[PDB]
Symmetry: D2
Subunit: 267 residues, 4 copies
């Protein structure tokens, strides 16, 4: 297995459509022993994670809760066993209130909402690394999920800004992680039809917003030299596992694009 | 003059070492009619702005104060006269608490501090554009100040993250501004010996922090094919005035580097 | 005038639709004294340049002709007068045989054709700088024309590769130019309806190639926050003049995008 | 093994210090069946490739020789068996005459020399893909070797330009390759102490050139958050094998940096 014997924490499962669910599934397929973290709907997440190939401890983690972060390393160690450390960490956490993303005008997002989104989507990458680097092994890997924010685009609005901030945070986390012999990287994924995305295409945010996302997806598959299937999360999960493995050992502070090559093509 | 007859709002003067002071001076030299905004210490900044070549109304603007932002367009119009609009806006505002920039470890910055720095340094570019675009003329120009954050570096820490966010914000502000026939761009400046920077070189943050910024400056001038004089703000001021002028009419959502070409050279 | 008293060499006029023709016209409008260079069709170019606002010496320059390059500085000095030097140089020269650009498959371009295109479009920027830096004044400016090649695209093929090479060459020319107190930069322009482009939209290269360029142009104006008028070269000429002026004094080895902000927007 | 059962062509072995030698070794360790190509000194390179873990056919390929390219697919098929195709191709080929790289002034490189370097270092990536895509399986992978040319630097001169061109070529090769379900990517490696590089550090190009590459290496390891050991090619070889594997299936037209994260850090 690509990740045989590795202990990997995976955050961000809320449904079986979560990118984190597929990351977890592929990692287990490849021999990893997981610890999972979830937020808020733990009963729901327990039932979901029971559908993974293998058993894994589930720990509560609200990244805005300072006490959860302060206790996380101790709680992980209790879950994986004293004398064991993590080899991998997956951050698959993002949030921006609908005032900052969707149909609301860019200028009408109140800062308190933007600030909450940046806390969860960008700052928390640093706070999770702070909590977990003390219990990570040399050769380990931290991976976060990104959406290429180098150009502006309709609807994504302040979530784009949060991803820009995340990319910056990743480069600083790499500095810290390197002291432990750990890599930090992001995977910038193409669009994936989560339940939220399928609701928007179906008209949840109105006719315009539905047309804009359809146009995004059509164009994405068009530009990608190898195509892009927004219904298939597996290529993204595999890429995360590649970064968690020993096969990209000289890559850190970086961004790997799992997007069909769309970002390399203008039209 | 390059800016003859243009009405330009300039924020961010606090001392005569402020980059905004030099922007204001060069703009007035080139025929612009200015409106100034200042934060907190208005009596102090009145005495500073009295040293500009020409008189200009000074308005209070704390960018975290929703009431100041709601009233700003009306107060500007009162200053410049009913029926008149602005041709230019300069955002030269930045702030990050010392928990997020300087000698404090990257992981030890509390989010409340980071959030305040992002509010003032990045979000407020959008807030100022929201307030002022309704009173800007077609062909106008919004310019903000940047420090290239595409790579991590010592000390600058979360202010780097805030600049990464600002760059993303500028691309969205360009979308909104374009509806009014207005451009939005940032100038990424090399290091300038403001009073803060001269205090750091002089040892205010310790021997190490002093050594790091000296190494930055030495290396910057070395890499810059035309050199870089950190004691001369005029090249930066001129570049801002170039973007305020009619001579870059097809550039928006962009970043102009006034950095001696340092960012184009590895070594 | 923005360029009052400056002596500026402008290459690349072949018709009154050449971007170089508009650069020359705006520069003369702004007080510059020009020297023009042309290739091959000098009788044609003489009649064209007679339509500029003001008189200007026309010198022959085939950039692949080593003797033309070896004599160019002497010939310029003879044209502008002993004791006078240039303040500016415009490279507006590009060429790629139709085996390397248009409808021919990317893999079917013979290297001799690609090599000729790279010589003219990229290497010649260095060879013109070598010839002319010895007769340029401190504070001077060399500007070349670019088309953003950071992503692949239909049809442009090996001309894209040539522009990628040009961007690299510009960063090295900046190193050399800086020794003379001279800046080197490129202007990356959006698409402009030259006679060649209008022929292609009209069907000269077939129905597919016509549809692809139409799609390029439509999308360009759509993405640009301030729009993009492919029939109007003036915004590009002005940007070149901004770089030739004293108002971007700290920018070198760089690329300024005169493209309506299209490259900053995904959709 | 990571590459179990895959048939992979590897070019660019000339010594056991070649990056291609290590790529070949790691690929064989991971179960790949190789076909090797060599230039000029086949008897010499037979003796070198005899030191790989396993036997592999060695085919002659001078990438400037049109007849070698025309026959290559047939010769590969003969080696691997009728009905069998390649799953991977490695381009590890580079060349720039000393007039274009080293101690010679940038402006003193004759175009004939630059053109030869671009032919071998950049164009041949396309030529090899043209020859081999017709005998590549869906899901296959083409990988070329890069040195980040986004910024200028001492000494590397026109080889930097050739790498800039290669990066552009890779994005076009991705377009073609995608028609076959094949990916095309480059690995941008940090500096590796090949026999050429060790000769330069030892003084072969003079005291200055020696001092410049020592300064490069020192700075590279300093900037890299996980360090950079120029005497260890294995991290680079592994990264190439990661791209040859099934674990980066949605990455194409792209660049993976196996450089210790140096390019993500300013200082
Ligand atoms: N869906 C796409 O098209 C796409 C593509 C690129 C990358 N991404 C990124 O992938 C990641 C996963 O998103 P997804 O598409 O799987 O959506 P999702 O809604 O399934 O996942 C987001 C996760 O963040 C968690 N979260 C929210 N607030 C939290 C908090 N306070 N503490 C801890 N966890 C919290 C949610 O519970 C959820 O599990 C995000 O970072 C997202 O921005 C999404
Ligand atoms: N000095 C440098 O080396 C350098 C280089 C690159 C860019 N910059 C940028 O230039 C801009 C100006 O900084 P500077 O170096 O002239 O320093 P400065 O301290 O003189 O300017 C910062 C300004 O921001 C104002 N400000 C802070 N909080 C505010 C608030 N709540 N509301 C309104 N205004 C507020 C301050 O009063 C001050 O006038 C900043 O964005 C900075 O990041 C600085
Ligand atoms: N037209 C566009 O859409 C567009 C946009 C971006 C930039 N550009 C670039 O702008 C520049 C000017 O192109 P244009 O659109 O004005 O087309 P053009 O055909 O008018 O100009 C190209 C010029 O190169 C000259 N040239 C060719 N071979 C030469 C040689 N051996 N020696 C000297 N001069 C030689 C030609 O005579 C001609 O004057 C080029 O570098 C082009 O690639 C074009
Ligand atoms: N050494 C480094 O620091 C470094 C770092 C980044 C990337 N690279 C790249 O890695 C690749 C391999 O270089 P290397 O350092 O292993 O050196 P090397 O000299 O061992 O490899 C270069 C290879 O190119 C081959 N070659 C030259 N002309 C050829 C032709 N006409 N036809 C076919 N093959 C030809 C040579 O025989 C040799 O095998 C190159 O692209 C190089 O730019 C090198
Ligand atoms: O020490 C820093 C001063 O800048 C910088 C920026 C970049 C780099 C360094 C220092 C070291 C190498 C890279 C942070 N910092 C702390 N207080 C400050 C007040 C004003 C401005 C900056 C301030
Ligand atoms: O000297 C150079 C050796 O590389 C490099 C690369 C980058 C940089 C330097 C040197 C100095 C700082 C930046 C060119 N060079 C000359 N002969 C060579 C043979 C093999 C490889 C390179 C060769």
């Amino acid at each position: 297995g690509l990740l045989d014997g590795k202990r990997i924490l995976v955050s961000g499962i809320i449904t079986d459509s979560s990118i984190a669910f597929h990351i977890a599934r592929v990692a287990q397929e490849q021999g990893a022993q997981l610890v999972l973290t979830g937020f808020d709907r733990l009963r729901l997440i327990q039932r979901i994670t029971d559908r993974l190939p293998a058993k894994a401890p589930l720990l509560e983690l609200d990244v805005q809760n300072e006490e959860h972060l302060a206790s996380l390393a101790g709680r992980v160690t209790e879950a994986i066993g004293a004398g064991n450390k993590l080899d991998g960490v997956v951050h698959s956490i993002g949030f921006m209130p609908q005032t900052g993303m969707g149909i609301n005008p860019f200028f009408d997002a109140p800062y308190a909402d933007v600030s909450k989104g940046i806390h969860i989507s960008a700052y928390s990458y640093a706070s999770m690394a702070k909590a977990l680097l003390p219990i990570m092994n040399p050769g380990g890997s931290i991976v976060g999920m990104d959406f290429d924010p180098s150009r502006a685009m309709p609807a994504y609005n302040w979530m784009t800004v949060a991803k820009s901030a995340l990319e910056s945070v990743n480069r600083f986390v790499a500095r810290e992680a390197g002291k432990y012999g750990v890599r930090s990287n992001l995977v910038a994924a193409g669009p994936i039809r989560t339940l939220a995305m399928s609701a928007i295409v179906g008209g949840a945010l109105g006719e315009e917003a539905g047309a804009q996302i359809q146009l995004l997806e059509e164009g994405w598959d068009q530009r990608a030299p190898i195509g892009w299937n927004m219904k298939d999360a597996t290529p993204v999960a595999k890429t995360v596992c590649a970064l968690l493995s020993d096969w990209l050992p000289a890559t850190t502070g970086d961004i790997i694009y799992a997007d069909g090559g769309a970002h390399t093509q203008l039209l």
